[PDB]
Amino acid sequence: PEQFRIRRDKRARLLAQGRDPYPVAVPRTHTLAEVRAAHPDLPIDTTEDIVGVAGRVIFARNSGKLCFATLQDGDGTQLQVMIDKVGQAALDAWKADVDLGDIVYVHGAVISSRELSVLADCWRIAAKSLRPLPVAHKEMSEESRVRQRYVDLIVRPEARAVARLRIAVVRAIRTALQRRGFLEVETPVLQTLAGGAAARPFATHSNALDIDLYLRIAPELFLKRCIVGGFDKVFELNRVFRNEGADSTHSPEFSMLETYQTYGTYDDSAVVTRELIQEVADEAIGTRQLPLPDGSVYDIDGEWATIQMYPSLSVALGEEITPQTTVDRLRGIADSLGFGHGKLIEELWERTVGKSLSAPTFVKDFPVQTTPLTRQHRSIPGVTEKWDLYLRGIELATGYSELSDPVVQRERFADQARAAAAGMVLDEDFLAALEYGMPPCTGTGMGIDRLLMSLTGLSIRETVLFPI
Amino acid sequence: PEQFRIRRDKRARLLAQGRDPYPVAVPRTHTLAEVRAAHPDLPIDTTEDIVGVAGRVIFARNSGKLCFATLQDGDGTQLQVMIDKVGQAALDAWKADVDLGDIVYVHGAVISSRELSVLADCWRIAAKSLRPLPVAHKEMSEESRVRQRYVDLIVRPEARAVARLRIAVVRAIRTALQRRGFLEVETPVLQTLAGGAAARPFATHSNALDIDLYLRIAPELFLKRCIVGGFDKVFELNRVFRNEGADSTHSPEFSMLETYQTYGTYDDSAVVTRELIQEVADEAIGTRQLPLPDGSVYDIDGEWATIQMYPSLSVALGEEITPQTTVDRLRGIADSLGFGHGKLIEELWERTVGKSLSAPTFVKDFPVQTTPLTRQHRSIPGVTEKWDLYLRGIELATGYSELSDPVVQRERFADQARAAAAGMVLDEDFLAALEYGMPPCTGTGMGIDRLLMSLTGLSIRETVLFPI
Ligand SMILES: COc1nc(N)nc2c1C(=O)N([C@H]1CCCCC1(F)F)C2
Ligand SMILES: COc1nc(N)nc2c1C(=O)N([C@H]1CCCCC1(F)F)C2
Ligand SMILES: N[C@@H](CCCC[NH3+])C(=O)O
Ligand SMILES: N[C@@H](CCCC[NH3+])C(=O)O
């Protein structure tokens, strides 16, 4: 706590002496990992490979004529340094000047101790830390790890690995989609009215236009415009904003993938989603027998079951539930266990069938009420061609066979608007685009955080770099 | 105008007959481009390659026993269809049912007319357009093209090419950075206070937290946190939000690239920026002798000149200007042509040297006042290690040797805050991170819209898909 001051004082006296504790440049020749992969099996306690390395001093051990430190590169990789070879003054400076958490450059020969080490010709402070690292045991509380992610990444290896995983996962996704001929597009974040999902928006006032603008809840309506526009295959991986509460599967800002493919249906996009998720596991995790903090293994290999909502619900409840089942009947059943038809079906389905699922599973054929954007089913009356994908109990992803009928689409919105009216403007430009004609296409959505969670067992608070 | 109604009426009667004008599926076997690349040089007026194609009817020409139409796939590619082979009823339906702007599937043999055509076994409406296309000559006004981008992309080839260019450019960028070992990260859009640039923020109220949040003006402060965190090389390509006016180089929402590289300086990031831009041209445009709507050619090949701000200004003004030149002196000069020292230097420099530049040029060594985040110059007093890159007269990109000194950084912000005080909270967490120690690193910024503009001659209103 007081050591904040002595650190500040070492900076000040280093400046005064004409030593630079935040130099513009130091000539680092190699990352530590490069040095390692260069000398994998050096006869220990024995080379003229001179290098210039840098790193954070995370461990010091001083001893009269010779000091040893651990340099940890930013990615975790470790090289020990040993400060006769040059400078008594140098050794004194080392001792008086270098603290833990300081970034340090050293130039010299690579050797192995009686542990891979560089024995120094030169050395220099690259950066002076005016704050010690927490010992970290002292296990940084969950909400101090998130509020100081920079320290977390320094002190806790797993923080490093997770960060790098998300990054790998996201790249895996872009690779996979690009391989299949999808083009990534940028669609507006600031919108005059935010559609493509159910949620309350974030509103912000524009100075330029003296009007409110609304942060997107989803790119769907614009992505659809792109399909009208002649895009065959488009995706957009980026943030959406839902002005609502936070829980273990929900946060107001999060990164979601959306995907749109002309001349396929929800049956086609189901297959791609599977392949996509499996292909991600392979690239980023390396197995489809997923290890969990549980200590368990979750198998996502092979084919995944598809069930239908109404039938699977029927089996769970012991009676035939259809689009014709009244709200009065559903209410009764709901009660006997512990607004509208659609909402009741989904709710009962989750409370019965959904919760019981283990293996990866698509549920498909959804109530029309609760699916305003998705086409009516090709044969079955009363339902829409939508699936949800449940993986390891997490609601991962949806796909639709997309409603391209403007008149029907107009109605779906008129119903929506009239439901939440307090006395009714629709998204006229969207509908305008539909009436220019949108070819048959299937869209998907997927949450990145959900993806990682489902894959790893990590909480939403660990998957993102800087939450709050 | 009235044709809106007859189109709506054809939908309605098609529904009634049990013809589906928005079918879930049609079994398209090939894109038109696939058909083309399959039959590049077919002896005209002469094959048993049956296909299933789809496309928008953009040209109709009817003739008793035989109708011809142009199917244009979404990307522009064209195949003609010819509707004896099946159905008198079929030909009647064609004539009464199909209008221009309708999406249509046809299945049959590929042939060449007396023009590559498919002569139909089957055909079906995939989508019914309840709105005709504008003839487009009738040249869609600039602000009707942007407000209805979906129609633009249908009707105007160049709209198609530009859309696809931006997309190629953005991928080119990610390829280039990834090749060099940069990791792309996601940093928050919603912030408790927005830093990393000069601009007024967008503010939005949170329901979860009953507080205002501020849309990011720039990712820099968080990207820096990542470097502290041990990232060696990180970039973030994504939207930033500056609550300010729109002009020909400025819009409140736009996509920018930021880049951060440990153990290099502004001299190093200058080189990468060049290589990066040149590598983009190569991938996306195919030449570095850039064609312009001007009718001119702009050469971005080869090495680019670096000049210094103070000296180049001095030469332009005919007197020695230094960090020591007073605001009283600068004011005088400014006057004689037609707030603080820094602002005056930059202003004079632009009004004299900047405007005169043609070839690609870095200007470097900037006034300390106007560069709070960038390190002080290694030798030259009074200036910071920042460059700006001017390409074809457009302000494309900046790079810094990054200020990692927390105490200095604290001062820079205290000066800033006190300047715009009306009677002073700083970004304490940012500074906290700096005092954990950030290794020497060089950041860059670059505007995607600027990039495209500089490369192509296109206005900012054409480079983005959906502005306003
Ligand atoms: C943290 O992730 C989320 N946060 C909020 N607040 N809302 C959602 C998610 C999430 O993953 N969602 C999924 C649902 C299934 C389709 C894709 C999706 F991303 F939308 C909806
Ligand atoms: C349309 O682009 C922009 N709109 C606004 N409103 N502000 C800026 C740009 C843009 O490209 N900028 C550049 C300046 C040079 C460094 C990179 C940058 F992206 F910030 C600053
Ligand atoms: N917009 C959906 C995802 C895309 C569904 C298919 N059109 C959501 O917010 O969940
Ligand atoms: N944040 C800068 C770009 C990065 C400069 C280097 N740290 C801007 O808004 O222009």
CA B79 – ligand 3 centroid, Å: 33
Judge whether A376 and A368 are in contact, CB under 8 Å: yes
Question: Residue type at A42?
Answer: L
* B46: closest CA of chain A, how far (Å): 30
CB contact under 8 A, B25 and A101: no
Two tokens at B467?
Answer: 């502005």
Question: Residue type at A37?
Answer: A
CA B389 – ligand 4 centroid, Å: 13
Cβ-based contacts under 8 A for chains A and B: 293
Breaks (C-N over 2.5 A) in chain A follow: 46, 83, 114, 338, 423
Angstrom distances, CA of residue B151 to CA of A205, A268, B43, B157, B289: 29, 28, 35, 11, 32
Two tokens at B421?
Answer: 């005080």
Judge whether B369 and B325 are in contact, CB under 8 Å: no
Query: Is residue B461 in contact with ligand 2, taking CB distance under 6 Å?
Result: no
Closest CA to B375 of B441, B462, B320: B441
Closest CA to B7 of B125, B133, B105, B97: B97
Query: Is residue A445 in contact with ligand 3, taking CB distance under 6 Å?
Result: yes
Nearest neighbour of A436 by CB, restricted to B26, B150, B183: B150
Contacts of B268 (CB under 8 A, 6+ apart): B261, B442
Pairing type for strands A361-367 and A305-308 reads: parallel
Question: Residue type at B43?
Answer: P
CB contact under 8 A, A230 and B265: no
> Which residue puts its alpha carbon closest to atom 8 of ligand 3?
A197
Q: How was this structure determined?
A: X-ray
Considering every ligand atom, which ligand is closest to the CA of B198? Answer: 4
Which of A146, A150, A228, A386 is most worth mutating to test chain B (most B CB atoms within 10 A of its CB)?
Answer: A150
CA B371 – ligand 4 centroid, Å: 10
Closest CA to B319 of B354, B348, B350: B348
Roughly how many angstroms between the first and final C-alpha of chain A, as a whole number? 26
Is A129 touching B (CB cutoff 8 A)? yes
Helix (H/G/I), strand (E/B), else coil: B259: strand
How far, in Å, CA of A49 to CA of A77, rounded?
19
The count of other CB atoms within 10 Å of the CB of residue B186 is 21
Residue list, ligand 1 pocket, CB within 6 Å: A 242, 249-251, 254, 256, 395, 397-398, 445-447, 449-450, 460
Measured from the Cα of A198, ligand 3's closest atom is 9
Chain A residue numbers touching B152 (CB-CB < 8 A): 229
Specify the DSSP class assigned to residue B402: B
Measured from the Cα of A197, ligand 1's closest atom is 20
Closest CA to B464 of B294, B252, B291: B252
Helix (H/G/I), strand (E/B), else coil: A291: strand
Largest CA distance in chain A: 90
CB contact under 8 A, B229 and A150: yes
Helix (H/G/I), strand (E/B), else coil: B176: helix
| B361: β partners | B305, B390
